[PDB]
Symmetry: none
Amino acid sequence: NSRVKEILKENTLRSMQDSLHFKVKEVQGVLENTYTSMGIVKEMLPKDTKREIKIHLLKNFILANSHVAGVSMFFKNREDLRLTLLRDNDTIKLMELGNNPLAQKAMKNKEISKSLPYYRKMPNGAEVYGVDILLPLLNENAQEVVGALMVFISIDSFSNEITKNRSDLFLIGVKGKVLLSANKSLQDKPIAEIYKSVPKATNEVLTILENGSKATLEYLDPFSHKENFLAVETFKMLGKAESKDNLNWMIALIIEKDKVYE
Amino acid sequence: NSRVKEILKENTLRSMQDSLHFKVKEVQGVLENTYTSMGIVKEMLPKDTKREIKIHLLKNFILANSHVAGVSMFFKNREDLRLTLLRDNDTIKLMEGNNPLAQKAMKNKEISKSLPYYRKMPNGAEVYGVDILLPLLNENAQEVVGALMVFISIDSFSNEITKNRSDLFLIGVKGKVLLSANKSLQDKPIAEIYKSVPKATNEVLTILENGSKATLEYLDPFSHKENFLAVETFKMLGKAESKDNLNWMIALIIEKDKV
Ligand SMILES: [Ca+2]
Ligand SMILES: [Cl-]
Ligand SMILES: [Zn+2]
Ligand SMILES: [Zn+2]
Ligand SMILES: [Zn+2]
Ligand SMILES: [Zn+2]
Ligand SMILES: [Zn+2]
Ligand SMILES: [Zn+2]
Ligand SMILES: [Zn+2]
Ligand SMILES: [Zn+2]
Ligand SMILES: [Zn+2]
């Protein structure tokens, strides 16, 4: 009889990976839209335009990128072009930069680069878990680095794709850090600690993350005490960019085996 | 053997259906993100910028959207902005307007698409694809000043549909085979290819017209094997309100043996 459960397993794993594969392309496609939008800002910001047009550009960049929660502009030789725009249910512009190590890193890397996830205190006093995306600004003939573009992407804003009306997905960053899960208390914590009761399963997932592969496996969930089918799939979180910092993110999809078997 | 078979049949067909659903959602997601990117190019092109800026933005547009093989812009009052950018192992800039669909798109302020066709590329290769033409408007958004052409490579979607498998088919308007592992079938309608099964092909074409989805079974006259057939349609121009936003379809065959 159990060969029936075995076919049910075969069929469930197939659709998990197809389902998971879509979720990855969806999230990565969203990140790609933002990077594409950033490259346009990058191109226009340093052109011979007046301040208000540059502000006009940063505001519209936030408006059209719902997952962007902030953007900063820095210019070496123009004081009035050192601004930070943070999402405050609208946009709040704060004048300022220069000593910011993110602006300095942006100007020393030709390719799009990143920081690591972190909590930013927002104008309304709330904490937003996110990550910074960096680009350099170049003058007309591309000869000189003249400024920096710094984009704060909200990881919490991906709740729409990961946790809205479902609880079977995790977003995992480098070193196996949980970036977003339905279990809010897991954010910013490593899976080696969360799931230390299944070190063989976690060590495979972490290996799959480091190598940029994909896989399916089983594990006993320590929270539900039920065995889950688990599908993982990594993806380059900076997109098509060839960059030192274009590392692997991972999305996990779980299905408790009991629901399949009947 | 009774309840077991029923459990296996409908669980395998559900897995087949869900898999096709997520492939359809992958494809139209790739298209819509390309359309979002195109809308950005659309709005920036009329803005006050130098020729070199417009060119590099179109060049960046092609490189960011891997399914676009070509893009062209035409300005009514800027002859130096009548250009075509095509993939050529890299990107090649050519100079050119008289396209009746560009006139249609401009005069009516509506998006319009061409029929699928074969474009001869710079390197001599022939690429099956579709043209999507958009009007360009001035800053005040009241007068049409030009047109933007985007040549989407249908063949480039083999990475999602045809690579490493032969169980998927992309079907266009009136059952035209747009993409298939069997390349000889491209640009040919299913009504002729599978004339021997009018019941299934007529179902397919009705599903295509109604924008519906369904699973059915048919005897494939090529493989001589009983197969299931899951189909699902989708608007190929995304959410654009336009009488040219016809339904495309992805079809998935699974040999009835597996069930
Ligand atoms: Ca599939
Ligand atoms: Cl068509
Ligand atoms: Zn404005
Ligand atoms: Zn503008
Ligand atoms: Zn989103
Ligand atoms: Zn067990
Ligand atoms: Zn039944
Ligand atoms: Zn569907
Ligand atoms: Zn693709
Ligand atoms: Zn894919
Ligand atoms: Zn067989």
